[PDB]
């Protein structure tokens, strides 16, 4: 079997909000070390990389490594039926093609108990290696969302320029154009570990789907280098992380 119990249920609802809108299907890689999901959206332009360490679950049993194939829309519709304070438990009979979720109200002596069919899916994903990056910007996850949405009223694509001083998001559009400069200033802070200056262009269409993860973290970090993907990393406190990769242009 595999059986994991998560006392802060809301984490798992917040996760599936970020994902369900970007990727319909996805393969959960279960193991000793915990839960790993990696998918590209259907366009092959963005890539999602969820990690939940086993250590950050209240209970975690897992006999062999599994590959659970989940329709994320189906699983979102089900986690919608879980209260925010609820204690969520995943259970998958290894010897079964269905996944059970059990929501215990921490207060109310009430217990929801759903059961959802799984699918076969090629777990054989991509090999994103860890790298020194040229620029890293840590900023409030709110302010990153606030920025990404605001430039969407202007333009299709944002240009992220990064110096020592600060970071500048720029968009051109039909109606006009705009520039947002953050200067460097615990979670309310803006800070920039910078090897050398970078300027890159990205589709806002996508950065907007990423900011759906904004309720998972106080802060987000952006890691860029010359002509290689942007990494938008939302920390899932004391549990894991949700990394989004977007390819740049020209």
């Amino acid at each position: 079997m595999f059986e994991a119990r998560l006392v802060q249920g809301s984490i798992l609802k917040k996760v599936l909000e970020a994902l369900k809108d970007l990727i319909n299907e996805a393969c959960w890689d279960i193991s000793s070390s915990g839960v790993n999901l990696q998918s590209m959206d259907s366009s092959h332009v963005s890539l999602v990389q969820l990690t939940l360490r086993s250590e950050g679950f209240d209970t975690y049993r897992c006999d062999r490594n599994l590959a659970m194939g989940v329709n994320l829309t189906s699983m979102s519709k089900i986690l919608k039926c879980a209260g925010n304070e609820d204690i969520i438990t995943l259970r998958a009979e290894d010897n079964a093609d269905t996944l059970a979720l059990v929501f215990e109200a921490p207060n109310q002596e009430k217990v929801s108990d759903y059961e959802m069919k799984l699918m076969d899916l090629d777990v054989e994903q991509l090999g994103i290696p860890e790298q020194e990056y040229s620029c890293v910007v840590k900023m409030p996850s709110g302010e990153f969302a606030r920025i990404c949405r605001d430039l969407s009223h202007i333009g299709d694509a944002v240009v992220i320029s990064c110096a020592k001083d600060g970071v500048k998001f720029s968009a051109s559009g039909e109606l006009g154009n705009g520039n947002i400069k953050l200067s460097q200033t615990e979670e309310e802070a803006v800070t920039i570990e910078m090897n050398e200056p970078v300027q890159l262009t990205f589709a806002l269409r996508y950065l907007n789907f990423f900011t759906k993860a904004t309720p998972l973290s106080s802060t987000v970090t952006l890691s860029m280098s010359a002509d290689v993907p942007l990494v938008v990393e939302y920390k899932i406190a004391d549990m894991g992380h949700l990394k989004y990769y977007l390819a740049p242009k020209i």
Partner: peptide, 10 residues
């Protein structure tokens, strides 16, 4: 727009 398939592979 580049594909993120292009930078990393299986």
């Amino acid at each position: 727009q580049r594909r993120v398939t292009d930078f990393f592979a299986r």
